[PDB]
Design a protein around this ligand. Sequence first.
Ligand code: 10G
Ligand code: SF4
Length: 309
Amino acid sequence: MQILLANPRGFCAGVDRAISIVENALAIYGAPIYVRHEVVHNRYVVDSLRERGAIFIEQISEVPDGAILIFSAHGVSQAVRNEAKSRDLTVFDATCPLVTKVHMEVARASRRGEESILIGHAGHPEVEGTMGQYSNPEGGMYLVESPDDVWKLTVKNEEKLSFMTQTTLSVDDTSDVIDALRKRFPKIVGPRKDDICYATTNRQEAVRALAEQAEVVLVVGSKNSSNSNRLAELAQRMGKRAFLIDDAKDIQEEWVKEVKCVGVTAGASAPDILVQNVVARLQQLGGGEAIPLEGREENIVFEVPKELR
Ligand SMILES: C/C(=C\COP(=O)(O)OP(=O)(O)O)CS
Ligand code: SF4
């Protein structure tokens, strides 16, 4: 059985920075370091950091006075930030710079009382954080997930309207939502394309290339990782069987029995060690040397803040 690896796969720049922020804080200040929300959506990373003394909380009211609190890479609402700010907490912010860029646009529209529409999935923390930058009652901030949601939305002033997106969406589905927004609201303003980041775009392109060759695709990533679920969905829509797995224990032998080509990729929050263990289990089940596919080169790095070197 041949094993192909997607390229790029695995950690993006925002995840590598966020994990280093929690590790460096643990190193500088000792346990406990409080973290608002799982720092990235990956059980192995999160379990690791917990066992080293990070404590993951959903609400600032769970954190003690005098503590160090880190916001997760997915970002937080102004309400959460202000609630931390008014408490006796030392705060470090691991929000990815590419999420912060969208937050600033939302805040600018709020200041103007001009309405804004976010394309994203209800309840996800990045959506809570982004919708949470808008606060002007004169204006409005609306969430749409699909074309049908666009078809039902009505706004106060469709002449002064902009749109933003979640950074980890399906490139193809978001394209359809934007086409709907422009047909319903011809004066709507947005970025040239969307706010989907380089890493989500790149991993989706790499999985499309992988699934062209492979009969079965394994995506390493946790169940609550949105971007990892998009990679599995992409391969499934191409007619391949595709499974989202946390680690090599999750592989069922029936999934690869008599499969001639199996592909492996990893979401933006999954460490490479998990991919190595998956490759080792596929070898136990018959596969040969893993072959990396040629892929778009990534070169962006985001540094930790100097207070945490
Ligand atoms: C921090 C982010 C993504 C890195 O991957 P993740 O699995 O932690 O998060 P989602 O794909 O947003 O669920 C959201 S920008
Ligand atoms: S998925 Fe994109 S926006 Fe999110 S942390 Fe990674 S680089 Fe940043």
